[PDB]
Amino acid sequence: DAEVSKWDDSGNDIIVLAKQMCMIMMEMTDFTRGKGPLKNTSDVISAAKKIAEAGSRMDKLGRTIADHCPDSACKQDLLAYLQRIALYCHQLNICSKVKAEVQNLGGELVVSGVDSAMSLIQAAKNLMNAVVQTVKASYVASTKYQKSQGMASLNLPAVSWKMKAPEKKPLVK
Amino acid sequence: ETTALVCDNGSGLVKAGFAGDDAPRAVFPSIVGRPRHQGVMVGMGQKDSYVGDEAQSKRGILTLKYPIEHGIITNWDDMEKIWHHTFYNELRVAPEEHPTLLTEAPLNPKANREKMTQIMFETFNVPAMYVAIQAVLSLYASGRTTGIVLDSGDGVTHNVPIYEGYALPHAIMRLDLAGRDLTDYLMKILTERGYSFVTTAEREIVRDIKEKLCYVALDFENEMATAASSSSLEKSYELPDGQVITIGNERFRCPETLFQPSFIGMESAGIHETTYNSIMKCDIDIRKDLYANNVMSGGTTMYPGIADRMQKEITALAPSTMKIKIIAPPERKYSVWIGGSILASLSTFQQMWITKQEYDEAGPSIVHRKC
Amino acid sequence: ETTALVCDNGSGLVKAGFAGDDAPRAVFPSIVGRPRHQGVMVGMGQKDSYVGDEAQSKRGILTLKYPIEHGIITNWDDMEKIWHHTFYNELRVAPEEHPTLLTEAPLNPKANREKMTQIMFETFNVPAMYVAIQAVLSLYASGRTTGIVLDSGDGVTHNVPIYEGYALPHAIMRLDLAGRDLTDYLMKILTERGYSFVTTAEREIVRDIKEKLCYVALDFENEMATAASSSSLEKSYELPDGQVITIGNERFRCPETLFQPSFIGMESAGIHETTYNSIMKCDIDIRKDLYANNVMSGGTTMYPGIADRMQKEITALAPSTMKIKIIAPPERKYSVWIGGSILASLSTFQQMWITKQEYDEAGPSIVHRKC
Amino acid sequence: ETTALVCDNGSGLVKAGFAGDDAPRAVFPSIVGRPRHQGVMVGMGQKDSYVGDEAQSKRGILTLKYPIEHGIITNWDDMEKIWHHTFYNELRVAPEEHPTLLTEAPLNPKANREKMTQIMFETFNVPAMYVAIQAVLSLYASGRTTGIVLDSGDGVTHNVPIYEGYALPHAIMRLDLAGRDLTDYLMKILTERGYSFVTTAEREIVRDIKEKLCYVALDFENEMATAASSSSLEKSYELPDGQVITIGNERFRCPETLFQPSFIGMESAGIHETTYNSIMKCDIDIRKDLYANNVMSGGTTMYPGIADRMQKEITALAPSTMKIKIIAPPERKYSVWIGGSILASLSTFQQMWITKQEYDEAGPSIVHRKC
Ligand SMILES: Nc1ncnc2c1ncn2[C@@H]1O[C@H](COP(=O)(O)OP(=O)(O)O)[C@@H](O)[C@H]1O
Ligand SMILES: Nc1ncnc2c1ncn2[C@@H]1O[C@H](COP(=O)(O)OP(=O)(O)O)[C@@H](O)[C@H]1O
Ligand SMILES: Nc1ncnc2c1ncn2[C@@H]1O[C@H](COP(=O)(O)OP(=O)(O)O)[C@@H](O)[C@H]1O
Ligand SMILES: [Mg+2]
Ligand SMILES: [Mg+2]
Ligand SMILES: [Mg+2]
């Protein structure tokens, strides 16, 4: 959503990685209305194999923080979202090879753009919605346990995460 | 520098933010939902608790519980999950460097603020803490020092009469009938038309009905005579699956139990003659200043026509020469919070916190002497 | 290293292959034919069972039996011949070094998967095993985690409603009407024109008729009025012996029993108000996400016009504000296998196998706990 | 002289008779079956509806519908056929000269008794009428005026707490899990052994299974451990065609959903902490007189061992000094009728009927005021 747009590009490794994945997802989102650089189905398959690789690197970066936490009572909200991005990229790898062979065997007339490439957008919207919870669950585990030995070796202060305080709620209406 | 936190943790809703502002930064429901179905996909699981706003988009597979019932915290393990959610996950602050101002209803058990003063110090490690009464904070948000405060929330309602900054503790009345007991009456009253809402995720749908279609009639036994002669009051509401329900005279019979609590089997009096019985327990010299300053706070006091109805009923009880003015601000849902950001950002208040070293000489009984 | 096998042993067709791929390496029919005639030449004989593909090139001297009827394995000595055929003779692997992922319909007998566990461990000696549900694997292969899956195969059709990886087992419906009961209805409906197919080897000819000429009419009572007024719907088919048959209104009367099962004497409702009566047994919050994610799987859902007919019949039952999207992929015959290659090649799945060491401390009743 | 009729028209069974007797004169099932097959013989036809007892001898060619589902009459043309059958064809009376006492569940729609009043006056032309609640008439039949009545029927179960002839309507709880939802759980639970019952005429065979072999375990997690260690719990039942089925631990897993309603997918609590949660909503002075007088009524409360199980589960919730006595009479299936014959034959009751003269100044809305 617009929460990723509120983050700054000069952050640490996880913020600059989750900013690139929302730029790929924004190229597949407007393809449902046809206002993006991806013109036909054959570019959506190349982008879905790209967001499944960048999303497979935050499983690596997210597990360098999950093992440095001292007790097992705080990483339960972090490993629960690291196992969801293990599934959503395995679907994006295999259901892009499947839709490449259907496009190759039956031709280009079998795929229709919209309502045919929606099996890759729906599996990528669920990857992005489970990777902004992986940023937020890793921001908590990096500042709640900052002074412990092991977490400071990653060099992740609270100022490196460029997330601001939220807006004021409306009083009336 | 070191701006204080103000966490007004009522029943039903949690409002938090920074002291000195005019609006809360975090308003989310106070529910902790756990899944009740069987998970088939691997990975979809290992997350056995959803707190706040993410347990209402994902209701329909969860069982929603409230940790605070009737103003009293009943589940002390699900209440720590909400305080952990409103500091790190919602406000994105660190509690080790901000003092927090909590908020409690009057006439509560003394082991309810004796455990709030233990969790904030020994688990969240705040530098300072203070527990304030709800209806004394909704007088700061009106610009008054005198008045009588009807604070109708989700768990309890209470009247606190205050004159010149001096509270009268013998005239503080408290009802346990509030906005949650109007939802559970609306589920029972809607079975007369066929709609049966049962589950804990279906009580959030009938709660969103009463926030949109319910209103207080100015004369109940006249409005019940025009709801039967015609269909001029029936309004339609669309359920989450697309079904359209139609509600007639159940629109004003639901907030009428605040004025006639015999509908739900309670013996006590309505909110119009429990705010008059607490006026008549004050001194005679200050009753003229409480009749004119009648502050209404809380979210349950936001029905369309609850100020025009309540002014009609206290006028019929008070003597005919006293003028009666009911002050209902348009922002009265957040009045308990706005006075919390006024009190915690004061210059005189900064010597009244309960510091962490003061918690070491005493026990958790320090909060009874300083608050 | 040690790539898993994914053997979807459905009725009527066996699809096997390796986990992590995108297409099965082995698709052959699930028949075991035995010769019924008298062998005169010495040498032709001493071979009393043909399995799979060579029992259809050599039919006409064989009687063809199906070991799995209605999703339940009826012949346990002929099912071992198909598993022996699909490992050694068809996939050319050794089962002693590959773990296999079997596949079963919901609401089957518990002694059906208790004997698949006993056979793979005590006869084929696999290192690990797992038995999955069919309609949960056709959501893996569809890019979703929420949705309702109509999986129409050869023995059974079943609906499994799933919301965010959480299944609702009280809303799982199952019909025994499937594709093999449309072959036996086409044999009876073709006798009105004179063509009489009788034998077990003549049922594979009328099965190839319905895969080529049968379709689903969008309006049945209008299509029967234009099938009799003109002859624009008739199409010809050539038998294996050179004869040409002509089929008129039996092209759409054969797949119409999925929507009107009173043609075969069944009392059950169609597949358009079985997929709706299982949505309306789910909770009200998740019904908007099951109307829009309506996955169709299996081979019997491949008639021309079964998606445009089914959108017509749920929009006549669902409320008028819900939008209904039916997801019919072009490769929906192999959807149950592709989600089996997804699940077995998963990084987090590799602790959910039923290992051979686990099979010794329990009996064959371990498959009920772990699956 | 002009002895009144008492028609307890429950879901699943209709009990009728004369007021003042000790037993009903007419007990027949509440089904209206219509033929679904093709009639070939001339004369054997022209009869499109069988009601009551001859729609169970002639089932197997019929489709059996229930006009009352969950205590609410869904089919108003099929319900006129059962009232016409129970007056003329079964009781052999003329309804123009007998006043009838109908019977309704609590917390029903208000247009349910507004159409029983319209049909009994404008079609059957009775001189007088009265509609009573079910669970108050099962206190007349026990010789009590105080107590709490669990009335488990076929559509609904409900608790009505009554102290000295004064009912507490804020503590009346109502479930929709009843005996018909244990038949539909027995159909699903029996597919694990191979037996599949599908049709509406096959749901009456699995209903006769649970009336003969089903019982309530005293300790469920111990009985499930001795049902698997041996075969001392299995009992055989013979189908109408001579086939013998064998049922093991499905004898006590079917009535266990009354105490654990999470089996059939419902969220709400069991019947042991619904009859306790409605005790704890009454006044504290009358709770000692409701723990000792615990009336159990209806047909679903007739499993062998539901009284010894329910005393085990309320004494684990109630305080340790209150003694708990559960009063299950041996004739508790007809308790709602016997109190109907007690009330309608009373000397004081004879001015509380709704006469046909009173029906003319009002509409059908007179039944809400006089009942
Ligand atoms: N606009 C409204 N109209 C009527 N009732 C309302 C409205 N908004 C909220 N309510 C009721 O009042 C409650 C809000 O009270 P609130 O002050 O948020 O409670 P708390 O003291 O627990 O924070 C809602 O849960 C609902 O029952
Ligand atoms: N084009 C088609 N039109 C109609 N039915 C088809 C078509 N192709 C295959 N079928 C049917 O699909 C079934 C086989 O596909 P599948 O669902 O994989 O079978 P199974 O589930 O028994 O393994 C058979 O009943 C066959 O008649
Ligand atoms: N011996 C029994 N054991 C269990 N259930 C029974 C028994 N006898 C009758 N029932 C159940 O009781 C119900 C019918 O009795 P009753 O309570 O009078 O029905 P209703 O309230 O629908 O008129 C059915 O659900 C039936 O299965
Ligand atoms: Mg409040
Ligand atoms: Mg299949
Ligand atoms: Mg009854």
Residue numbers in the entry:
A (entry chain L): 699 to 871
B (entry chain A), C (entry chain C), D (entry chain B): 4 to 374
Question: Can you provide the manuscript's text about this entry?
Answer:
Using the Iterative Helical Real Space Reconstruction (IHRSR) approach as implemented in Relion 3.0, we obtained reconstructions of the metavinculin ABD (residues 879–1134)–F-actin complex (left) at 2.9 Å overall resolution and the α-catenin ABD (residues 664–906)–F-actin complex (right) at 3.2 Å overall resolution. We find that the α-catenin ABD also undergoes an order-to-disorder transition at its N-terminus upon actin binding, as no density for residues 664–698, the majority of H0-H1, is present in our map, confirming recent reports that this region is important for activating α-catenin’s actin engagement. This is accompanied by a twisting rearrangement of helices H2–H4 reminiscent of that found in (meta)vinculin, as well as the extension of H4 by three turns (nine residues) through folding of the H3-H4 loop, to sculpt a major actin-binding interface sterically compatible with the filament. By contrast, density for the α-catenin CTE is only present until K871.
Our studies focus on the homologous adhesion proteins α-catenin and vinculin, which are major ABP components found in adherens junctions (α-catenin and vinculin) and focal adhesions (vinculin) that are critical for the force-dependent strengthening of cellular adhesion and mechanotransduction. Approximately 3 Å resolution cryo-EM structures of both proteins bound to F-actin (to our knowledge, the highest-resolution structures of ABP-F-actin complexes reported to date) reveal they share an overlapping major actin-binding site.
